[PDB]
């Protein structure tokens, strides 16, 4: 069907894929906060 | 043996070793285990894997 039974080597492969994704997303997220105008204005103030 | 360095040394030597390894895609042979000179590159790579 639509479900794709996956064997254990691509099971770990989609896992370390997914670890990259979650880490890369968090990295970008916090980069957009530490590059936002609002931050710059404030960090300059303090 | 385990040692420590200066903090102003650790900012320059640490982050400059990291950007030696990003801008060209370098290889870094170390002594392997987390002792001394490898203890400083582990904290420098801790700075690497938080911002690059």
JSON list of C-alpha atoms in Angstrom, two decimals:
[
{"chain": "A", "resi": 1, "resn": "UNK", "atom": "CA", "xyz": [0.00, 0.00, 0.00]},
{"chain": "A", "resi": 2, "resn": "UNK", "atom": "CA", "xyz": [1.06, 3.61, 0.71]},
{"chain": "A", "resi": 3, "resn": "UNK", "atom": "CA", "xyz": [2.99, 2.29, 3.77]},
{"chain": "A", "resi": 4, "resn": "UNK", "atom": "CA", "xyz": [6.58, 1.35, 2.87]},
{"chain": "A", "resi": 5, "resn": "UNK", "atom": "CA", "xyz": [8.02, -1.45, 4.99]},
{"chain": "A", "resi": 6, "resn": "UNK", "atom": "CA", "xyz": [11.64, -0.48, 5.47]},
{"chain": "A", "resi": 7, "resn": "UNK", "atom": "CA", "xyz": [14.53, -2.74, 6.45]},
{"chain": "A", "resi": 8, "resn": "UNK", "atom": "CA", "xyz": [16.78, -1.85, 9.38]},
{"chain": "A", "resi": 9, "resn": "UNK", "atom": "CA", "xyz": [19.64, -0.25, 7.44]},
{"chain": "A", "resi": 10, "resn": "UNK", "atom": "CA", "xyz": [17.43, 2.45, 5.95]},
{"chain": "A", "resi": 11, "resn": "UNK", "atom": "CA", "xyz": [15.67, 2.54, 9.33]},
{"chain": "A", "resi": 12, "resn": "UNK", "atom": "CA", "xyz": [18.89, 3.85, 10.89]},
{"chain": "A", "resi": 13, "resn": "UNK", "atom": "CA", "xyz": [19.53, 5.85, 7.70]},
{"chain": "A", "resi": 14, "resn": "UNK", "atom": "CA", "xyz": [16.25, 7.76, 7.97]},
{"chain": "A", "resi": 15, "resn": "UNK", "atom": "CA", "xyz": [17.07, 8.15, 11.66]},
{"chain": "A", "resi": 16, "resn": "UNK", "atom": "CA", "xyz": [20.42, 9.88, 11.17]},
{"chain": "A", "resi": 17, "resn": "UNK", "atom": "CA", "xyz": [18.77, 11.89, 8.38]},
{"chain": "A", "resi": 18, "resn": "UNK", "atom": "CA", "xyz": [16.19, 12.94, 10.92]},
{"chain": "A", "resi": 19, "resn": "UNK", "atom": "CA", "xyz": [18.75, 13.82, 13.59]},
{"chain": "A", "resi": 20, "resn": "UNK", "atom": "CA", "xyz": [20.46, 16.08, 11.06]},
{"chain": "A", "resi": 21, "resn": "UNK", "atom": "CA", "xyz": [17.15, 17.73, 10.19]},
{"chain": "A", "resi": 22, "resn": "UNK", "atom": "CA", "xyz": [16.16, 18.42, 13.79]},
{"chain": "A", "resi": 23, "resn": "UNK", "atom": "CA", "xyz": [19.59, 19.83, 14.68]},
{"chain": "A", "resi": 24, "resn": "UNK", "atom": "CA", "xyz": [19.89, 21.94, 11.50]},
{"chain": "A", "resi": 25, "resn": "UNK", "atom": "CA", "xyz": [16.41, 23.37, 12.07]},
{"chain": "A", "resi": 26, "resn": "UNK", "atom": "CA", "xyz": [17.26, 24.33, 15.68]},
{"chain": "A", "resi": 27, "resn": "UNK", "atom": "CA", "xyz": [20.55, 25.92, 14.48]},
{"chain": "A", "resi": 28, "resn": "UNK", "atom": "CA", "xyz": [18.71, 28.03, 11.83]},
{"chain": "A", "resi": 29, "resn": "UNK", "atom": "CA", "xyz": [15.93, 28.97, 14.29]},
{"chain": "A", "resi": 30, "resn": "UNK", "atom": "CA", "xyz": [18.36, 30.42, 16.82]},
{"chain": "A", "resi": 31, "resn": "UNK", "atom": "CA", "xyz": [20.34, 32.06, 14.01]},
{"chain": "A", "resi": 32, "resn": "UNK", "atom": "CA", "xyz": [17.24, 33.96, 12.89]},
{"chain": "A", "resi": 33, "resn": "UNK", "atom": "CA", "xyz": [16.74, 35.15, 16.48]},
{"chain": "A", "resi": 34, "resn": "UNK", "atom": "CA", "xyz": [20.38, 36.21, 16.83]},
{"chain": "A", "resi": 35, "resn": "UNK", "atom": "CA", "xyz": [20.28, 37.99, 13.48]},
{"chain": "A", "resi": 36, "resn": "UNK", "atom": "CA", "xyz": [16.90, 39.69, 13.90]},
{"chain": "A", "resi": 37, "resn": "UNK", "atom": "CA", "xyz": [16.79, 43.49, 13.99]},
{"chain": "A", "resi": 38, "resn": "UNK", "atom": "CA", "xyz": [15.09, 43.55, 17.42]},
{"chain": "A", "resi": 39, "resn": "UNK", "atom": "CA", "xyz": [17.96, 41.63, 19.01]},
{"chain": "A", "resi": 40, "resn": "UNK", "atom": "CA", "xyz": [20.67, 43.77, 17.34]},
{"chain": "A", "resi": 41, "resn": "UNK", "atom": "CA", "xyz": [18.93, 46.95, 18.63]},
{"chain": "A", "resi": 42, "resn": "UNK", "atom": "CA", "xyz": [18.81, 45.52, 22.20]},
{"chain": "A", "resi": 43, "resn": "UNK", "atom": "CA", "xyz": [22.24, 43.85, 22.46]},
{"chain": "A", "resi": 44, "resn": "UNK", "atom": "CA", "xyz": [23.63, 47.20, 21.23]},
{"chain": "A", "resi": 45, "resn": "UNK", "atom": "CA", "xyz": [21.69, 48.93, 24.02]},
{"chain": "A", "resi": 46, "resn": "UNK", "atom": "CA", "xyz": [22.88, 46.66, 26.88]},
{"chain": "B", "resi": 1, "resn": "UNK", "atom": "CA", "xyz": [48.81, 15.37, 31.09]},
{"chain": "B", "resi": 2, "resn": "UNK", "atom": "CA", "xyz": [45.76, 17.58, 31.60]},
{"chain": "B", "resi": 3, "resn": "UNK", "atom": "CA", "xyz": [46.40, 21.32, 31.43]},
{"chain": "B", "resi": 4, "resn": "UNK", "atom": "CA", "xyz": [44.67, 24.66, 30.86]},
{"chain": "B", "resi": 5, "resn": "UNK", "atom": "CA", "xyz": [45.41, 27.75, 28.77]},
{"chain": "B", "resi": 6, "resn": "UNK", "atom": "CA", "xyz": [44.62, 31.45, 28.98]},
{"chain": "B", "resi": 7, "resn": "UNK", "atom": "CA", "xyz": [41.05, 32.53, 28.13]},
{"chain": "B", "resi": 8, "resn": "UNK", "atom": "CA", "xyz": [42.10, 35.17, 25.59]},
{"chain": "B", "resi": 9, "resn": "UNK", "atom": "CA", "xyz": [44.38, 32.53, 24.10]},
{"chain": "B", "resi": 10, "resn": "UNK", "atom": "CA", "xyz": [41.46, 30.09, 24.02]},
{"chain": "B", "resi": 11, "resn": "UNK", "atom": "CA", "xyz": [39.22, 32.49, 22.09]},
{"chain": "B", "resi": 12, "resn": "UNK", "atom": "CA", "xyz": [41.82, 33.16, 19.38]},
{"chain": "B", "resi": 13, "resn": "UNK", "atom": "CA", "xyz": [43.45, 29.70, 19.13]},
{"chain": "B", "resi": 14, "resn": "UNK", "atom": "CA", "xyz": [40.13, 27.94, 19.62]},
{"chain": "B", "resi": 15, "resn": "UNK", "atom": "CA", "xyz": [37.94, 29.71, 17.07]},
{"chain": "B", "resi": 16, "resn": "UNK", "atom": "CA", "xyz": [40.84, 30.13, 14.65]},
{"chain": "B", "resi": 17, "resn": "UNK", "atom": "CA", "xyz": [41.44, 26.40, 14.68]},
{"chain": "B", "resi": 18, "resn": "UNK", "atom": "CA", "xyz": [37.73, 25.92, 13.91]},
{"chain": "B", "resi": 19, "resn": "UNK", "atom": "CA", "xyz": [37.78, 28.35, 11.01]},
{"chain": "B", "resi": 20, "resn": "UNK", "atom": "CA", "xyz": [40.96, 26.71, 9.78]},
{"chain": "B", "resi": 21, "resn": "UNK", "atom": "CA", "xyz": [38.78, 23.61, 9.48]},
{"chain": "B", "resi": 22, "resn": "UNK", "atom": "CA", "xyz": [35.68, 25.18, 7.92]},
{"chain": "B", "resi": 23, "resn": "UNK", "atom": "CA", "xyz": [37.09, 27.41, 5.22]},
{"chain": "B", "resi": 24, "resn": "UNK", "atom": "CA", "xyz": [39.24, 24.78, 3.53]},
{"chain": "B", "resi": 25, "resn": "UNK", "atom": "CA", "xyz": [37.65, 21.60, 4.89]},
{"chain": "B", "resi": 26, "resn": "UNK", "atom": "CA", "xyz": [40.74, 20.61, 6.85]},
{"chain": "B", "resi": 27, "resn": "UNK", "atom": "CA", "xyz": [41.69, 17.38, 8.59]},
{"chain": "B", "resi": 28, "resn": "UNK", "atom": "CA", "xyz": [42.86, 17.50, 12.21]},
{"chain": "B", "resi": 29, "resn": "UNK", "atom": "CA", "xyz": [44.97, 14.62, 13.54]},
{"chain": "B", "resi": 30, "resn": "UNK", "atom": "CA", "xyz": [44.88, 14.83, 17.34]},
{"chain": "B", "resi": 31, "resn": "UNK", "atom": "CA", "xyz": [46.08, 12.55, 20.11]},
{"chain": "B", "resi": 32, "resn": "UNK", "atom": "CA", "xyz": [42.63, 11.01, 20.35]},
{"chain": "B", "resi": 33, "resn": "UNK", "atom": "CA", "xyz": [41.59, 10.92, 24.00]},
{"chain": "B", "resi": 34, "resn": "UNK", "atom": "CA", "xyz": [40.25, 13.96, 25.90]},
{"chain": "B", "resi": 35, "resn": "UNK", "atom": "CA", "xyz": [43.46, 15.05, 27.64]},
{"chain": "B", "resi": 36, "resn": "UNK", "atom": "CA", "xyz": [45.34, 18.35, 27.61]},
{"chain": "B", "resi": 37, "resn": "UNK", "atom": "CA", "xyz": [45.71, 19.74, 24.10]},
{"chain": "B", "resi": 38, "resn": "UNK", "atom": "CA", "xyz": [42.76, 17.61, 23.02]},
{"chain": "B", "resi": 39, "resn": "UNK", "atom": "CA", "xyz": [40.79, 19.01, 25.99]},
{"chain": "B", "resi": 40, "resn": "UNK", "atom": "CA", "xyz": [41.06, 22.48, 24.46]},
{"chain": "B", "resi": 41, "resn": "UNK", "atom": "CA", "xyz": [40.07, 21.36, 20.96]},
{"chain": "B", "resi": 42, "resn": "UNK", "atom": "CA", "xyz": [37.02, 19.63, 22.40]},
{"chain": "B", "resi": 43, "resn": "UNK", "atom": "CA", "xyz": [35.84, 22.89, 23.93]},
{"chain": "B", "resi": 44, "resn": "UNK", "atom": "CA", "xyz": [36.73, 24.70, 20.69]},
{"chain": "B", "resi": 45, "resn": "UNK", "atom": "CA", "xyz": [34.69, 22.20, 18.67]},
{"chain": "B", "resi": 46, "resn": "UNK", "atom": "CA", "xyz": [31.94, 22.65, 21.26]},
{"chain": "B", "resi": 47, "resn": "UNK", "atom": "CA", "xyz": [31.93, 26.28, 20.13]},
{"chain": "B", "resi": 48, "resn": "UNK", "atom": "CA", "xyz": [32.00, 25.06, 16.50]},
{"chain": "B", "resi": 49, "resn": "UNK", "atom": "CA", "xyz": [29.00, 22.74, 16.79]},
{"chain": "B", "resi": 50, "resn": "UNK", "atom": "CA", "xyz": [26.92, 25.53, 18.33]},
{"chain": "B", "resi": 51, "resn": "UNK", "atom": "CA", "xyz": [27.34, 28.18, 15.60]},
{"chain": "B", "resi": 52, "resn": "UNK", "atom": "CA", "xyz": [28.51, 26.80, 12.23]}
]
